[model samples]
Target: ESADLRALAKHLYDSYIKSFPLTKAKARAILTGKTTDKSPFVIYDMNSLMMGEDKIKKEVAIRIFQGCQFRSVEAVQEITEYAKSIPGFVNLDLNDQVTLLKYGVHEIIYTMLASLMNKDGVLISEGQGFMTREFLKSLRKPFGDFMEPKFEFAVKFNALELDDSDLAIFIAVIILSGDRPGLLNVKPIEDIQDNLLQALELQLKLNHPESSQLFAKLLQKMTDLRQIVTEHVQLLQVIKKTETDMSLHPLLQEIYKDLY
Candidate 1:
């Protein structure tokens, strides 16, 4: 609906092609070589009212957290330390496991914020630390007081430190993260609906046709996740359009940028 959307899509596509052009191209070639047409079915223009926004937001936020998970010991330990140091962290009920999950979730937010603040004249995470402090203070007042973050890290975001470029990347990550669900290494939910069905189906057929019993189930689960994410993405676009309410939320409202 907005030029920003197209720009982001194009930018990501270009990055994908540049980073793994051969892999992506080879995948295309292999798919093209096949005569069978088992590609996903397209369902267009679905109404957002079907599932509602609360579900969509949770689904999206969960996905965003998933993509930011760490698989390394060093990274896990770093996040662990972060959680142990938060001001009121002990007040929360999080165990070491839960703390790690929170760390991954907040780290994703921070990384997304960092990406969006890359433009000139915008502040980076440098001297503008005070801005982050204020933003964190806002979060502390609301939900911050209840569930503590392990790290002294805050949630406040300053517009001056962030730029349109960084936001572009953040939004792109949001779109991609839904395909994965879990905390650092734990599968928080049994079936969180990441898009594994299609890939599983292919592996079942081509790699393990002899033991292809789970193909149908995997495909079904994948489809369910895809639908949920697609619906949520559509809703977010609409929300981004009427962002007046979101903008009025103090810190968020102060941040502004060009779409394209």
Candidate 2:
């Protein structure tokens, strides 16, 4: 019984990756948290509309936020498509699906972040913005505190240099996670995740026979992702407290609404 479920999950995983192939530029964009070149609305020139330096700074911040938000939205859309294509995921009630995605999207996004990161740091707002480890630490409270720890973990995770296939499986493991605080059907989700874990282990062994420790290291990344997302939620809360004027996109607000 479980064997059939595993096959379905793997087949769906491969099909999803095939449907949404990652080109070099797209890969670079993901690594740097930049919007993909193919994204819509790519040609707006903010510089021409600036009234003053203060306005320019504010607009730049808005653009940066929009760019980063767009990337996250697109990535989650891809994940939603993948979820719908799989029979196992489709069998769950719509409410449960929404619950899983709401809780799981942050961790899954960060897992994908591992591929884009380097020892120096991640690319934010595509190549339009870059935050190095040292510079991130120099920021004032709330703004700088959230990303520093994520960068610290991502730098080490990037050192592993996981390929896209491995990354897809790792993401599957996160997507199927049943441990999120408010799931309605934990046992079924947990069962699916166990199968994914086994499949990932087997794939890692076959792919890197000489490197026995790689699987263990990758397993640890799941924990890292959980920690990073927790920090992100705290950062969002702090932002709401100190920066009430800074509005979050509706999609982003929805994702964070029940997280805390």
Candidate 3:
């Protein structure tokens, strides 16, 4: 089991985590020293979704929303490659691999988001700066409501302070969740998930022995991600109903089809 973990651990980092240009440690450095207590300045104008205003409209929010879709290629690819690396994942039915990946990728994305996040904000533009929670709340209305929960989840998730190795195993468990719909061979995937869960539980205990509830809360965060993403999709559909000025990336469109 551990040997499975050791191999799975390395693959998640090299293929999955490594895709991000910035490291969590480097992002902390950017938020350091004098700026620690203050809201850090996020360099927004530099990216495609440039914004410098205090208030955001639905139209402008979509511009920023467009900026988000740009990374879908790497984001989806990162999870796909890592999902395949699990030891027993190779033996699963072909359709099950695709089915499992569809939802698992979204669940893991927010956990990955917390890697660069602190309580107040998250790093963006590769440590160029961060978007404060209030800043996103400026996104307005159902849009504003749509974005806040991830930060709340991220802040609490970051509070656990899990490192990449533990994160890797946790992700392995999520990818083969075995709880997702339409699995032809649930038992095989369940056994693999069970192994990774054991790996994740032991890792947290060994590393965070004093935090008695850490692992349980960590499991809760997984549910929190699904809830957050569920609303996000619903809100996007709402967005689609009223607007066509913005374009979702093809991959985002593909993912939305099954979920919606």
Candidate 4:
């Protein structure tokens, strides 16, 4: 059983971590403020995206919406792939799988986002880019507000200094959550979550001698994740009501609505 658990842990790392060219050592260094060979910024012309002549500010909002949409889509793909790689995930009732992914993706994404975060904030475009908390706040209205708390939580969470092995298991815990609403058969899902938690606990005990507070800190982060996502959806609702030109991608919108 222990060997199987370790293999599952290894599969999670091999499948998802390797999917991106970035390795765990490299990412750890980046998030720890120890590396500087960062990737360059994406060529987005802020002036063009926020043309002053528009005067309505809708253009800037739209650009921000599009950038976030793109990133969100990529995040969902990664989350989906990771979930699929887990044994028996696909064997679950289809609706249960959908429910878990729908409500759980944002939580998992924000958790993974911590790995890319430093005290400054998360990097984008393969680390060629950085989105400072202040810069994100200046994006425009609710669009700016949407990301502030996420980075706030992210910076604090990254302070935990969890390595890839621990981070990978933590993500598995988020993905396998049984508390997602509308789960038709919660027992099996809870069982999976319990198994992952056990594996994580064992790994922490063996690998981190200083594990006195680490596990407690990690579990508390789930609450933080829920709080961040809740705030995000609230801002999205405000944006939807106030902005005529900006709209969320259908899937993204659905995820928000499902959370409600």
Top candidate on TM-score is 4
Clashes of each: 13, 3, 0, 3
lDDT of candidate 3 over 1-260, digit per residue (tens)? 67665454556556546544554555555666445433345633334235433322246666557655775556687778777777788789998998888878778877787776766666655555567666677765656665577888888787887777677778888888777887898899999887777767777887789989788988887778888888888888887877766667787777667763
Candidate 4: tens digits of C-alpha lDDT, residues 153-256? 87788777677777777777887788788889888988888888887877776678775867877798788988888888877778778977668888887777
Tell me the lDDT of model 1 at 211. 52
lDDT of 4 at 228: 85
What are the runs in model 3 whose C-alpha is more than 4 Å off? 1-21, 33-59
- By summed lDDT, the worst window of 10 consecutive residues in model 4 runs over 48-57
TM-score of each: 0.19, 0.75, 0.82, 0.85
Each candidate's root-mean-square deviation in Å? Answer: 22.5, 5.9, 4.6, 4.5
Worst 10 residues of 3 by lDDT: 48-57
Model 1 alpha-carbon miss at residue 38, Å: 37
Candidate 2 runs further than 4 Å off: 1-13, 16-62, 124-141
Candidate lDDT (C-alpha), each: 0.30, 0.65, 0.71, 0.73
lDDT of 1 at 61: 27
Q: Which ten residues in a row have the lowest lDDT in candidate 1?
A: 251-260
Give lDDT tens digits, candidate 1, residues 1-260: 34444443345344433432122223222323443322211111122212322222233323222222322223334334433332233343344335334323333334333322212111211211111222222332232221122122212232222223322232233222322333332332212112222222333454345554544533233233333334433443554575434322222222111111
Which whole-number lDDT from 0 to 100 does residue 136 have in model 4? 65
Please give the lDDT score for candidate 1: 0.30
The lDDT-based order of candidates, best leading, equals 4, 3, 2, 1
Query: What global local distance difference test value does model 2 have?
Result: 0.65
